[PDB]
Design a protein around this ligand. Sequence first.
Ligand SMILES: O=c1c(O)c(-c2ccc(O)c(O)c2)oc2cc(O)cc(O)c12
Ligand SMILES: O=c1c(O)c(-c2ccc(O)c(O)c2)oc2cc(O)cc(O)c12
Ligand code: NI
Ligand code: NI
Lengths: 183, 183
Amino acid sequence: IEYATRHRARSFIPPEPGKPYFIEKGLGDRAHLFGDLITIYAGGEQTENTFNFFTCEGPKGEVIPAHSHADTYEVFYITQGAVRLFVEDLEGEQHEKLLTPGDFGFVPKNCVHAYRMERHHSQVVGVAAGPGGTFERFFESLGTPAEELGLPVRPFVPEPEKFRTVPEQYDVRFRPDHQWHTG
Amino acid sequence: IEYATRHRARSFIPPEPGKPYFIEKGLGDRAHLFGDLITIYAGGEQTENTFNFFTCEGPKGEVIPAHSHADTYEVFYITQGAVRLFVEDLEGEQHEKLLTPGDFGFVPKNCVHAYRMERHHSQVVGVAAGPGGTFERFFESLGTPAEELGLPVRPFVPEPEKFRTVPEQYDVRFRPDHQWHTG
Ligand SMILES: O=c1c(O)c(-c2ccc(O)c(O)c2)oc2cc(O)cc(O)c12
Ligand SMILES: O=c1c(O)c(-c2ccc(O)c(O)c2)oc2cc(O)cc(O)c12
Ligand code: NI
Ligand code: NI
């Protein structure tokens, strides 16, 4: 049931748009980025570039790098574990909430955010899209695509140069110095 | 905190875009259609009409009426129970798969589809959008908005005049003529 695409020599996402398809649990296109596994079930080529659908799952760990997107809206829908989401609104106040499976978090464009996984193997459902396309392939770009199944045994830490060549390709703006005012 | 919006007197989706928000499990805008509960956590007003985010849960039931979307792509991502997805491709080849939690189904536009829920209280995470915009307010339109939590105690059966008016507003082609071979 395997295809070959511009993204993977082995994929369960067909290369031709307008094709119905199913993908079993965990078999979307995969990518590592630090301790986490990102799995892509649908990309821009599936939806005339209107949206995507992916999951992000990883071990108990520290708050990911603060960042924003300018033309992209994000969804955080927890399916496993517990994840803490940090958002900063346009005015400037910062809110956090431990999101348990079934809970939902929305981060609008130009809003600074970050998430922390507070249970082992937590999992988040994600959508990331907007006016100027979908940004699913960001993860395998900054990080690495992976043929392995499961969590990375060891974090994939990108060499620092990736943090420049990529942000000007994937609508993402890191804020290496950021604060979080709530604990 | 509850807001008033153009869709609900009481809602956890803010009325104004650019505002980040959290919603607790089950507390999105709710709708009933047949025996199914649809819960909206994000609509077009949140993402500049690019995408939405909703869940669909219901009792073990019959196959929903077969239908198609001219300009809308559908995600089926199963979170509870098990859901059998029926799709017909553009070339007339029908396809059937039982989707268990973590499995993913994709229905591209113009593809005739229908789902059957095969465990009590199965749950599907959906996204329905395309070039034309987002689809979410369809369910409360064909069916009804709902203030209660939990599954409809008894199914909401829309008037046949709703079956005529709604497609003129939402992007749904009902197919009472369609036969599913696969089985
Ligand atoms: O930029 C990032 C981003 O957008 C997401 C993300 C994850 C899950 C979602 O559901 C979502 O909408 C977004 O994760 C990240 C994880 C990192 O380690 C580093 C990042 O830069 C991002
Ligand atoms: O047209 C319909 C539709 O699209 C969906 C749906 C459900 C879950 C999803 O995840 C999704 O993307 C779509 O349900 C329906 C249920 C009905 O009783 C009648 C319908 O006409 C639809
Ligand atoms: Ni982000
Ligand atoms: Ni449909």
